[PDB]
């Protein structure tokens, strides 16, 4: 929130492909403004692209001070992936006990 | 007078919007029974 | 006119002969206009911004 502030812009704006999704802020080690969206297929518009190995969720956030643009718009191109394999292993020790 | 007309620069919507639109609602008035010019200061 | 409407009122006169000699024929009719309206271009406007 500070760099934005600093960057000129009073109050910025939130935006996802839908308009619903509008930031807010949050504090866990500085004032920070951030947006939270589920990781599925289109509930904030958010595009599935499933290649063989993995599978990446890419949605664009808009930046403005005001909800009117006139110059310099700003699309934040964002995307974070999952791998489809991975390996797990029971926590606990087994005993077997035969005759 | 019967013809209203204004400027303004050019915007966009901030956001996943790509087209602009205009709305505007009239009101009539009598240019006699009533004061007609509104105006306005900060 | 009131507040809301302005009509405009006028009548109407009816008669075979120039001249009347029983059941006189008025027909007072007005149509009226609401003050507001709404409007709306049918043009479509796309910005184009850095
Ligand atoms: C299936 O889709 C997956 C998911 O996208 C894809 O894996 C991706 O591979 C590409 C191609 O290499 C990676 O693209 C990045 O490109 C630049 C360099 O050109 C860098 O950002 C990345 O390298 C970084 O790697 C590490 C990441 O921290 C660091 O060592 C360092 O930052 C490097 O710069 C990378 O090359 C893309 O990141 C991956 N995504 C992953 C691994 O999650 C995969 O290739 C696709 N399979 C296909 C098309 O067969
Ligand atoms: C300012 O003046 C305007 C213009 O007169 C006025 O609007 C008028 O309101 C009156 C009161 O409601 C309407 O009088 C009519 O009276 C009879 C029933 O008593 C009916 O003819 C009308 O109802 C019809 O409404 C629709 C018309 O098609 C239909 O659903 C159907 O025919 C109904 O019967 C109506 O009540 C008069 O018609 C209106 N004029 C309109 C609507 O153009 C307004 O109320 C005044 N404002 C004030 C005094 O603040």
Known sequence: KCQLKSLGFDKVFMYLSDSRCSGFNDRDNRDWVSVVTPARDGPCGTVLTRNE???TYSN???????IIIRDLNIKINFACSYPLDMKVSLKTALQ???? | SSQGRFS???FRFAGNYDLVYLHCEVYLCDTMNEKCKPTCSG
Do not use: G, I, K, R
């Not at chain 1, 664009?60 to 005001?66: F, G, H, S, W």
């Open chain 1, 53 to 55: 190995t993995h599978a």
């Open chain 1, 60 to 66: 664009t956030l808009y930046l403005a001070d005001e």
């Open chain 1, 96 to 99: 077997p006990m035969v005759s």
């Open chain 2, 8 to 10: 303004v620069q050019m």
